[PDB]
Amino acid sequence: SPGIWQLDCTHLEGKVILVAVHVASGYIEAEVIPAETGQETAYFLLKLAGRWPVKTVHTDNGSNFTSTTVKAACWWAGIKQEDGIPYNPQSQGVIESMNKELKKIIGQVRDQAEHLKTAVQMAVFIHNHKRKGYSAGERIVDIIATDIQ
Amino acid sequence: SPGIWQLDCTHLEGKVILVAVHVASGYIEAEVIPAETGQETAYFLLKLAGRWPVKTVHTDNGSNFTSTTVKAACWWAGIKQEDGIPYNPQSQGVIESMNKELKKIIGQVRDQAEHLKTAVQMAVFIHNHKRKGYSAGERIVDIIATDIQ
Ligand SMILES: C=CC[N@H+](Cc1ccccc1C(=O)N[C@H](C)CC)Cc1ccc2c(c1C(=O)O)OC[C@H](CCC(=O)O)O2
Numbered sequence: 001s002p003g004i005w006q007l008d009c010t011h012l013e014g015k016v017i018l019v020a021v022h023v024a025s026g027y028i029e030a031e032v033i034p035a036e037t038g039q040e041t042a043y044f045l046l047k048l049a050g051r052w053p054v055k056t057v058h059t060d061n062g063s064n065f066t067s068t069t070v071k072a073a074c075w076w077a078g079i080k081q082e083d084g085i086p087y088n089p090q091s092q093g094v095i096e097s098m099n100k101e102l103k104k105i106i107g108q109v110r111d112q113a114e115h116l117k118t119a120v121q122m123a124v125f126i127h128n129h130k131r132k133g134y135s136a137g138e139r140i141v142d143i144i145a146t147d148i149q
Numbered sequence: 150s151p152g153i154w155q156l157d158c159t160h161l162e163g164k165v166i167l168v169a170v171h172v173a174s175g176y177i178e179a180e181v182i183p184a185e186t187g188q189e190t191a192y193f194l195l196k197l198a199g200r201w202p203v204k205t206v207h208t209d210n211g212s213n214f215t216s217t218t219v220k221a222a223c224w225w226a227g228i229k230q231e232d233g234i235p236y237n238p239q240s241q242g243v244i245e246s247m248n249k250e251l252k253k254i255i256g257q258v259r260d261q262a263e264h265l266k267t268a269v270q271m272a273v274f275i276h277n278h279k280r281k282g283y284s285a286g287e288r289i290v291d292i293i294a295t296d297i298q
């Protein structure tokens with residue numbers, strides 16, 4: 001499970017925040033996009049896979065799962081595209097709690113930037129650095145390093 | 150050493166490719182921007198620091214070093230903003246060769262995407278995964294994990 005990520009789409013301020021969560025660590029990357037499209041999702045995954053060793057992505061919905069644009073990016077980047085069915089019911093709850101936390105952080109920083117995209121990157125920073133004790137940023141590096149060995 | 154990054158700005162197709170290089174590993178992140186401005190550079194560094202434990206950035210030129218927008222982002226993200234003077238003359242050479250490699254890879258993928266930004270992300274992926282043996286992606290994780298311990 002060092003290579004497993006989950007896609008998550010949440011909404012704020014009439015815009016869409018696309019999030020990828022590293023399941024084992026809770027580490028995240030995120031971007032603000034005007035709307036979720038196959039193209040936006042494909043480009044996001046391409047970026048993610050160039051930066052971390054992405055083996056599997058649990059897609060956030062059936063449209064992205066079906067999208068030939070998304071499938072082409074997953075093919076290119078060597079990603080196994082999977083469904084995101086919450087067979088473990090706790091995954092729904094975890095994602096919802098993450099979305100709430102992220103929105104809370106965005107509110108806390110919202111005044112320190114004009115644009116939502118900036119606030120979202122500040123939220124990513126705070127989330128990844130927060131010690132819960134290790135941070136999610138520390139956990140992901142440790143998990144992957146262990147795997148490489 | 151685990152936290153040192155170098156900024157690098159290169160040009161292609163009338164656009165600017167802003168690159169951050171993790172000096173110890175040769176791992177990179179990059180983006181295409183219309184022009185290098187303080188705001189573009191500040192936003193890039195904010196993203197980078199939310200994703201990796203960025204301690205020090207060697208800025209790519211005096212304008213970004215001076216920029217109060219860049220300084221404000223470095224303050225926010227806890228980054229030590231430094232000059233990028235190549236006291237070790239091998240630095241210029243390494244960056245020049247990296248820029249050449251990246252442009253080579255971009256040409257090799259250029260037909261697999263309509264937009265330069267896509268080709269640049271493909272180039273990041275190829276660069277970071279290339280075994281030279283370990284890849285740059287493996288080296289950065291190993292270096293930081295060693296630091297965390
Ligand atoms: C209809 C899809 C368009 N492309 C089809 C394509 C066109 C020409 C050649 C190959 C391919 C192709 O399938 N390529 C390989 C196999 C997979 C990468 C690929 C693509 C995807 C997402 C993007 C892109 C681009 C682009 O063509 O550059 O451009 C930036 C855009 C930014 C996000 C946003 O604006 O939504 O995200």
Ligand SMILES: C=CC[N@H+](Cc1ccccc1C(=O)N[C@H](C)CC)Cc1ccc2c(c1C(=O)O)OC[C@H](CCC(=O)O)O2
Pocket residue numbers: 111112113114115116117118119186188189190191192218221222225
């Ligand atoms: C003139 C600078 C602008 N801002 C000044 C600002 C305005 C209001 C409140 C605080 C601050 C402030 O200094 N904040 C803290 C201390 C530092 C983050 C900050 C900023 C920087 C880069 C960006 C931004 C934004 C933004 O205001 O959101 O928006 C997206 C843009 C995308 C790249 C591009 O388009 O160039 O990069």
Ligand SMILES: [Cl-]
Pocket residue numbers: 128129137138198199200201202
């Ligand atoms: Cl971090």
Ligand SMILES: [Cl-]
Pocket residue numbers: 049050051052053277278286287
């Ligand atoms: Cl990688």
